[PDB]
Design a protein around this nucleic acid. Structure first.
Ligand code: FES
Ligand SMILES: [K+]
Ligand SMILES: [Mg+2]
Ligand SMILES: [Mg+2]
Ligand SMILES: [Mg+2]
Ligand SMILES: [Mg+2]
Ligand SMILES: [Mg+2]
Lengths: 98, 133, 86, 96, 137
RNA sequence: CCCCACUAUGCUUAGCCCUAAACCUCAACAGUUAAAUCAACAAAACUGCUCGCCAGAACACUACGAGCCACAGCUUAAAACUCAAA
């Protein structure tokens, strides 16, 4: 039987290592006007702006290329014992996956 | 009705004491189920504490041997132009294949970190995977 | 006094735009702290008052930058509601 | 279990950031270098928020500038015009 | 050729000329903008006084001296008395932060002189003499 | 109080005087972050050990005594009468 330790060791997310400046594949699952919510396999989705080039091609279920900057955007502020989280990842939308 | 002192004991202890004391005529519907199958921890209120001095959280950082190799790879050949597909449970990145080849060479040869890296690069190029330093 | 003249705090006029040269010189003198130094040197500031003022400005700047950082960090969430109704 | 994590220093730890003058010697006779951290119009020494230098090298530059100024190597009230066309390393713009 | 705000260096040769003369040969208008009075003196490159005008020499009295109009009038008078000696181009050297700092140059321009550069030489001690005490008004 | 002028004084040398909201208003060393953390506020809560100090207010940064390069001075520092508060 495969233990949880083996699963974590051989998980693609674990294998990726640091998430900064890593190219990943995400899928559009929600659209709000020009805001595209993309899941790329992480804990949180990322919200991207619809590109001005071939914007019509970006629809729900579309596969897109992303450059990950942070898996979760957090920041400790003055006079706070715990970090404040926006519950979103940071990524840059590169284009559609051919 | 039961006591509303949520900070004293637990719901089970309060209900049990009130039932035995006669305040509650009948046990609630969940009392028997709780008694038969209790939780791992009794749900008792506790105030979280800020740590000071040398007190530290016991949470360890998750590291593996291959991570070293990965770091060097990500420092030498950079991030692979190929994109990661985290949805696939068995995705294999260029770095992962480099790691597997490195480990196979280590188990089938000597232990010289630079030589393993260079020969692993030669082997991957022989297989036909582009690797731009 | 012992320095060469027409090198320090000097701006050349372009195409007869004297007002632009004056405003550029004013910007330079204000940025380098000369204007506030001249204005503060008109009367003597006591050392304790000077220390209190310097501490106040330093803490004011730190607090203002931190608040700006917090507002910019939390500004990302200000978009159209994606779960309107529910 | 061989798959358990092992204790280890962070292998992905990025090298700690360096100032532009780190590892280099600051000498009071190098007026060309010291002139890169003073105002062209007033000769005032720029603060670290403008120069981007670390505290140690900021102090070194300040002491070298004062020594050169008092020993007759550097002007005080302005930057030497010969060094006005040197590379700009300070984060300050007069829109000039 | 990109315009340079930085004044020409007497040593380094430059092509900038004003009526055939170099930068270091242009007359200098020294403006002293005090809090209650403004003084303008035009001198030659060799420090020969050509013209002089203040707000007090133009009839203004007491608080009327420390106004923009008085400084403008003084600048106009200085410009006239300098034009009567062949002055066209001038380099302005301002000293002080008085109300006549800019009005004096406005008057000089309105009097017919052309300004080619503005210099500030306000006295800034590096903490020398102790200033007077603050007023308790 | 505003403006002008000008002294003692701020400066150097050789002696004194020994006071400050001389305050981080936190005594010095060593240790802990577990307990109900904890009157309140200030500055998270405590433990071991040692020195100094405090036992209602005012009289009182006072009187007297003693010491002092100080002589309208500094250190130490009470009592009587009075009150139910401070
Ligand atoms: S960062 Fe190393 S000397 Fe400045
Ligand atoms: K204090
Ligand atoms: Mg003190
Ligand atoms: Mg002690
Ligand atoms: Mg003691
Ligand atoms: Mg008492
Ligand atoms: Mg006494």
């Amino acid at each position: 039987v495969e233990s949880f330790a083996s699963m974590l060791r051989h998980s693609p997310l674990t294998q990726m290592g640091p998430a900064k400046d890593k190219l990943v594949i995400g899928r559009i699952f929600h659209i709000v006007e020009n805001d595209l919510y993309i899941d790329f396999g992480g804990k949180f989705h990322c919200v991207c702006r619809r590109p001005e080039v071939d914007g019509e091609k970006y629809q729900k279920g579309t596969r897109v290329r992303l450059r990950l900057l942070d898996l979760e955007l957090t920041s400790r502020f003055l006079g706070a014992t715990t970090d404040t989280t926006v519950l979103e990842a940071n990524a840059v939308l590169l284009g559609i996956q051919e | 009705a039961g006591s509303r002192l949520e900070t004293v004991g637990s719901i089970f202890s309060r209900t049990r004491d009130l039932v035995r004391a006669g305040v509650l005529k009948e046990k609630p519907l969940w009392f028997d189920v709780y008694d038969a199958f209790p939780p791992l921890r009794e749900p008792v209120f506790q105030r979280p504490r800020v740590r000071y001095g040398k007190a530290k959280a016991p949470i360890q950082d998750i590291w593996y041997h291959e991570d070293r190799i990965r770091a060097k790879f990500y420092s030498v050949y950079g991030s692979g132009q190929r994109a990661f597909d985290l949805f696939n449970p068995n995705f294999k990145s260029t770095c992962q294949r480099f790691v597997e080849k490195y480990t196979e060479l280590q188990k089938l040869g000597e232990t010289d970190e630079e030589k393993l890296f260079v020969e692993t690069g030669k082997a991957l190029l022989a297989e036909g995977v582009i690797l731009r330093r | 006094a012992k320095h060469l003249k027409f090198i320090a705090r000097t701006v050349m006029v372009q195409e007869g735009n004297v007002e632009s040269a004056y405003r550029t010189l004013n910007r330079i003198l204000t940025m380098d702290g000369l204007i506030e130094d001249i204005k503060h040197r008109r009367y003597y500031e006591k050392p304790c008052r000077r220390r209190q003022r310097e501490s106040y400005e330093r803490c004011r700047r730190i607090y203002n930058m931190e608040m700006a950082r917090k507002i910019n960090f939390l500004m990302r969430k200000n978009r159209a509601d994606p779960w309107q109704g529910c | 279990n061989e798959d358990l994590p092992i204790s280890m220093e962070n292998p992905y730890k990025e090298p700690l950031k360096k100032c532009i003058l780190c590892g280099k010697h600051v000498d009071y006779k190098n007026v060309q270098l010291l002139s890169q951290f003073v105002s062209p119009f007033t000769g005032c020494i720029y603060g670290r928020h403008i120069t981007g230098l670390c505290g140690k090298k900021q102090k070194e530059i300040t002491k070298a500038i004062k020594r050169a100024q008092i020993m007759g190597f550097m002007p005080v009230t302005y930057k030497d015009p010969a060094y006005l066309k040197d590379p700009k390393v300070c984060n300050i713009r007069y829109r000039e | 050729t990109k315009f340079s705000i930085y004044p020409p260096i007497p040593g380094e040769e430059s092509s900038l000329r004003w009526a055939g003369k170099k930068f270091e040969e242009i007359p200098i208008a020294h403006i002293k903008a005090s809090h209650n009075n403004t003084q303008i003196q035009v001198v030659s490159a060799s420090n020969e006084p050509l013209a002089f005008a203040s707000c007090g020499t133009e009839g203004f009295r007491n608080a009327k001296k420390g106004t923009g109009i008085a400084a403008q009038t003084a600048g106009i008078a200085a410009a006239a008395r300098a034009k009567q000696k062949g002055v066209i181009h001038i380099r302005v050297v301002v000293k002080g932060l008085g109300p006549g700092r800019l009005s004096a140059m406005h008057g000089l321009i309105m009097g017919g002189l052309e300004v080619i550069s503005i210099t500030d030489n306000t006295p800034i001690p590096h903490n020398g003499c102790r200033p007077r005490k603050a007023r308790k008004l």
